[PDB]
């Protein structure tokens, strides 16, 4: 039998509640077998290859596609040639918001240097004790938690003026 529209909304409210545990992770610092065309994002992968590290998500929230004029005034985000608006946890079933927006940025120097070709969000990452900083290399982590969402990326690089911004818009069941 069938999951309701609002069940996806409620599960999306659960993911937003997990926000503390949500980390962007970057990896694949060496070449793909084809640098012109990265391989397929196998959903059986529990981890990124050649893990550079992890950064806390900066923004985890419910969203919907925006509409004008009424939303123009609200907090807006631009993604996929479309404009999106932030939704708050109690409003969710009043709005219809089954989409979660996830983001982080790597502030210049805050991780080891150079290229990356994998990007994803884990949740339930637990640090080793007495660590509290939002940016972790794998040798600082106590549990990696669970890789929730990820993507495969091309030969574009990082160094200290190039703060890099990575984000998704997703839903739990992308295809009911």
């Amino acid at each position: 039998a069938i999951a309701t529209y609002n069940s996806h909304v409620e599960l999306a409210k659960y993911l937003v509640s997990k926000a503390d545990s949500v980390y962007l992770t970057i990896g694949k610092s060496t070449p793909w077998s084809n640098e012109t065309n990265p391989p397929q994002p196998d959903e059986n992968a529990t981890v990124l290859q050649e893990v550079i590290g992890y950064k806390k998500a900066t923004k985890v929230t419910l969203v919907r596609p925006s509409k004008s004029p009424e939303d123009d005034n609200k907090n807006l985000i631009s993604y996929g040639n479309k404009s999106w608006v932030e939704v708050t946890p109690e409003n969710a079933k009043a709005e219809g918001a089954k989409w979660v927006y996830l983001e982080s940025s790597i502030v210049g120097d805050e991780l080891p240097l150079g290229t990356y070709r994998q990007v994803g969000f884990v949740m339930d990452l637990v640090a080793k004790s007495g660590i509290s900083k939002f940016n972790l290399v794998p040798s600082e982590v106590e549990s990696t938690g669970t890789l929730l969402f990820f993507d495969n990326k091309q030969f574009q690089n990082r160094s200290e003026q190039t703060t890099a911004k990575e984000r998704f818009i997703v839903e739990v069941d992308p295809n009911s």
């Binding site: 923004k59 929230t61 907090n75 932030e86 708050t88 946890p89």
Partner: protein, 48 residues
């Protein structure tokens, strides 16, 4: 608890913290709300 022998003095010792909106969902802006734009501002001194 005391030993019951000789002098004993009971005293209060206060301790101080800076505390941040990362530890406190309450330090997140009512202009918007919870972790949201406008939201992660100042920390606090606190004494207990």
């Amino acid at each position: 608890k005391i030993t019951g022998v000789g002098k004993e003095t009971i005293g209060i010792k206060l301790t101080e913290r800076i505390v941040t909106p990362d530890e406190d969902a309450s330090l997140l802006d009512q202009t918007s709300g919870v972790p949201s734009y406008f939201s992660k501002g100042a920390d606090r001194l606190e004494e207990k």
